[PDB]
Amino acid sequence: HMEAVQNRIVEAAERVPGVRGVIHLRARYVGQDIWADMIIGVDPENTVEQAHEICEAVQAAVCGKIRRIESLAVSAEARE
Amino acid sequence: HMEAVQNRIVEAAERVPGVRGVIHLRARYVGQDIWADMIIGVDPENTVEQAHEICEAVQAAVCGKIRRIESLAVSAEARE
């Protein structure tokens, strides 16, 4: 339900080039809308700029696929 | 007072190689202890691993200089 929506968020994030898994996802309803914050893994040898580009790509992929999301923050952490 | 402690935190962070300013600092007292979270700027062309190393260096510099800090989280963002 919410679990259904979280699964969709993870799946959509994992399909973006450069994502090394979803490390963390917190999602909540504000009325009928979802507000979420997530942390993605990235290659430690990517540049900070590349990691920012991946996060922005995730934000666009996820919000394009899951139309109820009205706020999404995406950060990155090194992951082997 | 608290302003004195914040100034010390910023100064100590700015003295670590690789810091391109303090972007954000939130500090609060939990009893006599300080708990703080901060965001440092870094070179967009540093690797994610390098940025992690800078953040860890900041955590060590700051907590070494300001002994009342009992919790400090340090994250990075690209800054030109």
Numbering used by the authors:
A (entry chain A), B (entry chain A): 213 to 292
Question: What did the authors write?
Answer:
One group of metal ion efflux transporters that regulates metal ion homeostasis and can be found in all domains of life is the Cation Diffusion Facilitator (CDF) protein family. One of the most highly conserved and abundant integral MM proteins is the CDF transporter MamM. MamM was recently proposed to function as a magnetosome-directed iron transporter required for iron biomineralization since its deletion abolished magnetite biomineralization and mutation of residues within the conserved TMD metal-binding site resulted in alterations of magnetite crystal size, morphology and even mineral phase. To summarize our results we present an alternative model for the CDF CTD mode of action, in which we propose that upon metal cation binding, the CTD induces conformational changes towards a tighter and more compact fold which allows the activation of iron transport through the TMD.
Examining this closed state model, three putative binding sites were revealed, in which Asp, Glu and His residues from the two monomers are brought into close proximity and may bind divalent cations. The central binding site is presumed to be the main site as it displays tight packing and contains two symmetry-related His285 and two Asp249 residues. Compared to transcomplementation with the wild-type allele, single point mutations of the histidine residues at the putative central binding site (H285A) or periphery binding sites (H264A) affected neither Cmag values nor the number, size and morphology of the crystals. The D249A, H285A and H264A mutants displayed a minor increase in the number of binding sites compared to the wild-type protein, which may be the result of an increased void volume that allowed the accommodation of additional cations after amino acid substitution to alanine. Fourth, we confirmed metal coordination by the His264 and His285 residues by ssNMR. To confirm that these observed phenotypic differences are due to true transport function alternations, we also examined the expression levels of all MamM mutants, their ability to stabilize MamB expression, performed MD simulations for dimer stability evaluation and determined their CTD structures. (ii) All mutants exhibited an apo-MamM CTD-like behavior along the MD simulations, and (iii) an absence of structural differences was observed.
